Design a binder for this molecule. Structure first.
Ligand SMILES: Nc1ncnc2c1ncn2[C@@H]1O[C@H](COP(=O)(O)OP(=O)(O)OP(=O)(O)O)[C@@H](O)[C@H]1O
Ligand SMILES: O=S(=O)(Nc1nc2ccc(Cl)cc2s1)c1csc2ccccc12
Length: 286
């Protein structure tokens, strides 16, 4: 189609602000469709050497075609700014619901964990590592299905070299894998570590490695220093213990553990129908 331009849209509220981006709700005049438009200032990203992150985000998102990811519909630019046209995730961040509710029940924990597993299976099947999986980056659409976002720090592993490890230091402390801290590289299994953290957080309210700053958190991660609260659903506890494993080759779902089949077969997921999650009605959180 014709390249879109800013005047093709009526811009509305700011949906959120990043350190070098702003996301604005926009209605396309010719169609009445709503998009979340992520806008970046060229001078700002050139100055702060963020151009690689912007090109990474476009390149990775352009490869994705799955219901559990924010879709990139279009991009355009003017003299001052870059624009990403994204699907609008009307119900915002998963983190919001964790804070409000405190502790998901077992059915809700199972359902949302299954959608994240499904999404990661797709992503890893394409040879892509997210590297910053966290509840702030798991948005929710109008139907309360997940919409994973934030791919500027993701990595497309090279099939040509059978690349397994990536060397950029990226992520968020609470969810960073021990291999990134100690071996200075991430792999697909690093996302499975983050998954373990997120499952724990859905039930416990807070993620497992807790401290008031990053260095203290890093020290706990490499020691596997965490504990479960009382009443933590037993099969979920078992799953988390099989994800929060220091050796990245021993995490359920990783390539060396023979992939997503054994993970999806975990007893915590016994009642899950994997084939069509995005067409199932999500369980009510309250
Ligand atoms: N597709 C979307 N639909 C609805 N809201 C969105 C969408 N994408 C992002 N947002 C909201 O806008 C916020 C800002 O997103 P953006 O990617 O610009 O920065 P960030 O990732 O939050 O921050 P930083 O880049 O500093 O880590 C997000 O945290 C999220 O709340
Ligand atoms: O055209 S791209 O393929 N590459 C880029 N062009 C520019 C131009 C100026 C600046 Cl500061 C950065 C980039 S990076 C692209 C990546 S993200 C995005 C968003 C809107 C339009 C183009 C692009």
């Amino acid at each position: 189609p014709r390249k879109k331009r800013p005047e093709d849209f009526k811009f509305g509220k700011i949906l959120g602000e990043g350190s070098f981006s702003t996301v604005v709700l926009a209605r396309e005049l010719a169609t009445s469709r709503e998009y979340a438009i992520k806008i970046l200032e060229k001078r700002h990203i050139i100055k702060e050497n963020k151009v690689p992150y912007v090109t990474r985000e476009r390149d990775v998102m352009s490869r994705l075609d799955h219901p559990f990811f924010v879709k990139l519909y279009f991009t355009f630019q003017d003299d001052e700014k870059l624009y990403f046209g994204l699907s609008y995730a009307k119900n915002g961040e998963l983190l919001k619901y964790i804070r409000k509710i405190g502790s998901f029940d077992e059915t809700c924990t199972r359902f949302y964990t299954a959608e994240i597993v499904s999404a990661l299976e797709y992503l890893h099947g394409k040879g892509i590592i997210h590297r910053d999986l966290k509840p702030e980056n798991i948005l929710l659409n109008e139907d309360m299905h997940i919409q994973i976002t934030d791919f500027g720090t993701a990595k497309v592993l090279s099939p040509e070299s059978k690349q397994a490890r990536a060397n950029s230091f990226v992520g968020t402390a609470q969810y960073v894998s021990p291999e990134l801290l100690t071996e200075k590289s991430a792999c697909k299994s690093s996302d499975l570590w983050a998954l373990g953290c997120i499952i724990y957080q859905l039930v416990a309210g807070l993620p497992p490695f807790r401290a008031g700053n990053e260095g203290l958190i890093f020290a706990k991660i490499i020691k596997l220093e965490y504990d479960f609260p009382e009443k933590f659903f037993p099969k979920a506890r078992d799953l988390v213990e099989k994800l929060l494993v220091l050796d990245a080759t021993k995490r359920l779902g990783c390539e060396e553990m023979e992939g997503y089949g054994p993970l999806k077969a975990h007893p915590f997921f016994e009642s899950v129908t994997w084939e069509n999650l995005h067409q199932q009605t999500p369980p009510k959180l309250t």
